[PDB]
């Protein structure tokens, strides 16, 4: 049973590195980045054992270690919460980061700051792990703002390039609104439940969970990219590619909904909650479908795709199917991590243009990366029968049925379809036409770092979703009796949009002069510029009102010194005349004997 004490070993196996990154200050020059990588794998196998132990006997034991202060009636310590959410997730996180770190050893080899870079990226991983293993909601909060500020630093990896650090600042801003929601949920849990302890909140189910759980909706929408707050991703591209990979797959934007999954028994009820869920995750699916197309930076396409995914997962928290979502988070991590970590092969291999215009055809000394792009593309299409199918298709089957408000069904359909048409875009451009781009081919695929990275990630991917497939101890009744026309539409929509977009950008006739109004609203009628610029001016307006209270404050104090200016007149009321104060003090002195005569 104490092999789960080895599970609380692996976290310190991760803890080990930064200590090496500080104390010795020389042998790090020996290529520790390799060393960090090895620590990640050690955490992968040593983290793999507990999963097996669980999936035979279950047996999830929470440990409190030594308690954190006391205060009044609630002693909050810290914990590591083995939920099978943690048990199953952490090997995925460590695995994908194994990939991204080896790939990074290929990506940053020129950068002189590489060591520091791994210090960060690793530390980011620590914040994730400590988030997804925690129950006690204060420790959640810790991992929450930890991964947040780590997003700030990593997206801000490049000092200078005002664009970059600016994007970073917008990101951390949105995280902080998600925070206001989160600490709302915390406070409510105090006053009403006299704790935040993720066990105790589960035990006593509040009759009224409305307000706090709404707060949880907000906190989820902050990080998760959800609607009403978009701009996170597309400017979050400004970070270096590997950081972007790790950012959209295993961490952050998934850790937004990971909280809602964490509280799932509390969101079982208040159909107000599921209502808002599918009222919103929907809006991100079709919204990002409407605003995603035609923007020509490959990395950015990948971004908006992950946004649409996240929408679909929010919808999966809709109704009640939290586990299906959870599985789709893991699978999604594999697939899109693959997709980025290949797109870097494209970019850096090309020099770097990273625009979908130019680019070229599929196979030009690029066999393995393109293979990764139709494994990952063909993958993220919704799969025909492949791994992620075990997520997305089940998702649209159950969501396709029962009590959904039904505005979400069409949402699912055209959503997934436009995902497929993203794929058709990146193939019909990056993989299709004979090469057109800046000449002097520099391209190289030859290096064990990439091939080994993408290698392991794809070998795993196709075989990982299959292990996750039927090791998922059954948590509910699957539909599994699926009616005609409510069954046959899963794959079928992916083929209707597959064919439709196919003929859209295939056999294109003369293209010149005008384009549509929708293409100008496909980039957008600003949801980026309107909110960022508009919402940027308002605080300055409040600085003008601040000049009103400040100028009125020193204008009132200037009314006291103006009362000291004309109070000097109360001194200057003296006429300095000996016939004035002498004889007036004599007359008014006889008026002191007049007032003293009657006083």
């Amino acid at each position: 049973m104490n092999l789960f004490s080895s599970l609380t070993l692996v976290t310190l196996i991760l803890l080990t590195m930064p200590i090496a990154a500080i104390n010795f200050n020389t042998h790090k020059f020996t290529n520790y980045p390799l060393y960090v990588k090895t620590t990640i794998s050690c955490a992968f196998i040593t983290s793999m054992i507990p999963t097996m132990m669980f999936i035979h006997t279950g047996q999830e034991m929470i440990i409190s270690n030594w308690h954190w202060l006391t205060i009044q009636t609630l002693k909050l310590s810290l914990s590591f919460k083995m939920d099978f959410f943690s048990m199953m997730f952490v090997p995925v996180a460590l695995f994908v980061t194994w990939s991204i770190m080896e790939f990074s050893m290929w990506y940053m080899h020129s950068d002189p700051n590489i060591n520091q870079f791994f210090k960060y990226l690793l530390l980011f991983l620590i914040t994730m792990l400590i988030l997804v293993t925690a129950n006690n909601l204060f420790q959640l909060f810790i991992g929450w703002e930890g991964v947040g500020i780590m997003s700030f630093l990593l997206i801000g990896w490049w000092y200078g390039r005002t664009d970059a650090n600016t994007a970073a600042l917008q990101a951390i801003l949105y995280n902080r609104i998600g925070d206001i929601g989160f600490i709302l949920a915390m406070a409510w849990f105090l006053i009403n439940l006299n704790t935040w302890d993720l066990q105790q909140i589960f035990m006593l189910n509040p009759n009224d969970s409305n307000l706090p759980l709404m707060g949880l909706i907000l906190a989820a929408t902050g990080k998760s990219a959800q609607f009403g707050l978009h701009p996170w991703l597309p400017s979050a591209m400004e970070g270096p590619t590997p950081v972007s990979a790790l950012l959209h797959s295993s961490t952050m934007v998934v850790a937004g909904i990971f909280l809602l999954i964490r509280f799932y028994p509390l969101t079982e009820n208040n159909k107000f909650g599921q209502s808002i869920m599918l009222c919103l995750g929907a809006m991100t699916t079709l919204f990002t479908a409407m605003c995603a197309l035609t923007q020509n930076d490959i990395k950015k396409i990948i971004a908006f795709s992950t946004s649409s995914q996240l929408g679909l997962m929010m919808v999966t928290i809709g109704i009640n199917q939290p586990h299906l979502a959870f599985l789709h988070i893991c699978t999604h991590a594999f697939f899109k991590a693959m997709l980025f970590m290949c797109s870097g092969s494209i970019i850096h291999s090309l020099n770097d243009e990273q625009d979908i215009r130019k680019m070229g055809g599929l196979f030009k000394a690029m066999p393995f990366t393109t293979t990764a792009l139709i494994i990952g593309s063909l993958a993220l299409t919704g799969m025909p029968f492949l791994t992620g199918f075990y997520s997305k298709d089940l998702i649209i089957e159950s969501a396709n049925t029962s009590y959904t408000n039904a505005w979400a069904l069409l949402m699912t359909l055209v959503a997934t379809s436009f995902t497929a048409i993203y794929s058709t875009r990146i193939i019909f451009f990056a993989l299709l036409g004979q090469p057109r781009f800046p000449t002097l081919i520099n391209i190289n695929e030859n290096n064990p770092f990439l091939i080994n990275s993408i290698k392991r990630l794809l070998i795993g991917s196709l075989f990982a979703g299959f292990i996750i497939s039927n090791n998922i101890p059954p948590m509910t009744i699957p539909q599994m009796t699926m009616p005609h026309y409510l069954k046959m539409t899963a794959l079928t929509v992916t083929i209707l949009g597959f064919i439709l977009a196919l003929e859209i950008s295939n056999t294109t006739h003369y293209l010149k002069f005008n384009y549509p109004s929708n293409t100008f609203k496909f980039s957008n009628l600003l949801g980026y510029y309107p909110t960022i610029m508009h919402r940027l001016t308002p605080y300055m307006n409040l600085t003008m009102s601040q000049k009103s209270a400040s100028s009125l404050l020193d204008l009132i104090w200037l009314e006291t010194i103006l009362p000291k200016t004309i109070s000097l007149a109360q001194m200057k009321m003296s006429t300095t005349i000996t016939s004035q104060k002498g004889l007036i003090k004599l007359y008014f002195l006889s008026f002191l004997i007049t007032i003293l005569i009657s006083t």
């Binding site: 005002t162 600042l169 902080r176 406070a187």
Partner: protein, 459 residues
């Protein structure tokens, strides 16, 4: 306590009689040796506040604040050098003497039992600071912002003596222990009005509430770095402290009387938090920051939940170290290029690659990062205020977002984005700078392990 009063008083002639060039060594040394016993001061236990002597005692809150003071002298004095490092000896011994005497009256104030001894030692604390910042403040036109600054204090700060002496002859003893157990309810009417308002506004002038906050910025831009770490790490916590104690009485009154001030602090938290976003001249940013956190403190004081105090005091200490340090960063940047204006230079991730870590680390500790004591205190305060009004979290968390924005904006455009390349002066770091930064953060990060020292009397 007297064992802490002698050693500094002896630390005065240590300064005065000494060979030239050893004054900093002697003072720093023996002052840290004081700090050890300041750390001895914690016996505090159980229920009764320890009482050293019938004249002055210590409960919890006085103990953390005091430890912070006696810890803060050696770091302060340590920091003040090289601001000058050229003068006649008399200037040096005069300045160190003044810092000493100031510390003495501070210890008097925090330890003081009886509120009149507290008050005498109160203005007696204000004078030495004034002499510091005015006699040499780098004096931009001098603003005369020390002197009528002392008028900002005394203007409405004198009548609290009146109200006190009233409390004296009505109830007899002004000993705080016996003012406790004898406190009797005071109904809401017009006499209790002018009284409550007297004491309240009297201390509220010190921790600036948004109405009076014009007090700080000028006084704190004109201050030499020693006078700054004096000012905003401590001299506000005096007002908030005495506030903590004299709110013992005024029991029902503070409700109907509190409400307007609470409103003003909840709005001014956001306002000040805004105006500090857009300004130039870095030295002001951290000032208005102090105004913001102190507004949050007042909010915590008036609502009387114990949570409110725990988070409150935690915010006193954490904001003390954080704000203090961050000032000292502004100064360490100022000696490099003579500006005070933020936007002037930039870069310093390239250059001074270490000084980054202290900028980052400190700014994060003012960003309310979860394990940091600043977020412990701020967090409990937000809990209390949400308990008081379910609605106020819009304003509170909105301060969370703004404080995030400027606190992380300072971290940039001083420290990042380009080197202005017409500079060619800045000399890489120092060992002293690293010593100062370290002596600030390292305890602020360690306290994030065993905080139960710094949480308030109620715990």
């Amino acid at each position: 306590m007297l064992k802490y009063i002698i050693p500094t008083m002896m630390l005065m002639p240590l300064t005065w009689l000494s060979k030239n060039s050893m004054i900093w060594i002697n003072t720093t040394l023996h002052s840290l040796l004081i700090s050890l016993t300041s750390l001895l001061l914690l016996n505090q236990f159980g229920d009764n506040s320890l009482n050293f002597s019938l004249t002055f005692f210590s409960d919890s809150l006085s103990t953390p604040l005091l430890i912070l003071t006696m810890w803060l002298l050696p770091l302060m004095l340590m920091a003040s050098q090289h601001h000058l490092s050229k003068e006649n000896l008399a200037r040096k011994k005069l300045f160190i003497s003044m810092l000493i005497l100031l510390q003495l009256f501070l210890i008097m104030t925090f330890t003081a039992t009886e509120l009149i001894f507290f008050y005498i030692m109160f203005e007696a604390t204000l004078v030495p600071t004034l002499i510091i910042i005015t006699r040499w403040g780098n004096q931009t036109e001098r603003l005369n912002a020390g002197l009528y600054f002392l008028f900002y204090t005394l203007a409405g700060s004198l009548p609290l003596l009146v109200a006190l002496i009233y409390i004296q002859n009505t109830m007899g003893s002004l000993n705080f222990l016996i003012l406790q157990y004898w406190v009797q309810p005071m109904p809401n009417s017009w006499s209790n009005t002018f009284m409550w308002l007297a004491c309240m506004m009297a201390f509220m002038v010190k921790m600036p509430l948004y109405g009076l906050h014009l007090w700080l910025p000028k006084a704190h831009v004109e201050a030499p770095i020693a006078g700054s770490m004096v000012l905003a790490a401590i001299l506000l916590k005096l007002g908030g402290y005495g506030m903590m104690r004299i709110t013992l009485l005024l029991n029902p009154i503070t409700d109907f009387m509190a409400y307007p001030f609470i409103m003003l602090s909840l709005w001014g938290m956001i306002m000040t938090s805004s105006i500090c976003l857009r300004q130039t001249d870095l030295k002001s940013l951290i000032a208005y920051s102090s105004v913001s956190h102190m507004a949050l403190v007042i909010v915590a004081i008036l609502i009387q939940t114990p949570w409110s105090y725990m988070g409150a005091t935690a915010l006193m200490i954490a904001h003390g170290l954080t704000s203090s340090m961050l000032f000292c960063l502004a100064n360490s940047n100022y000696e490099r290029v003579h500006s005070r204006t933020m936007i002037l230079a930039r870069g310093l991730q390239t250059l001074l690659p270490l000084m980054a870590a202290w900028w980052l680390l400190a700014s994060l500790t003012n960003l309310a990062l979860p394990p940091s004591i600043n977020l412990i205190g701020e967090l409990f305060v937000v809990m209390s205020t949400f308990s008081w009004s379910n609605i106020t979290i819009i304003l509170m968390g909105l301060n969370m977002v703004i404080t995030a924005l400027y606190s992380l904006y300072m971290l940039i455009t001083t420290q990042r984005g380009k080197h202005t390349h017409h500079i060619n002066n800045i000399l890489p770091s120092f060992t002293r700078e690293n010593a100062l930064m370290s002596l600030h953060m390292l305890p602020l990060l360690l306290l994030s392990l065993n905080p139960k020292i710094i949480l308030g009397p109620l715990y």
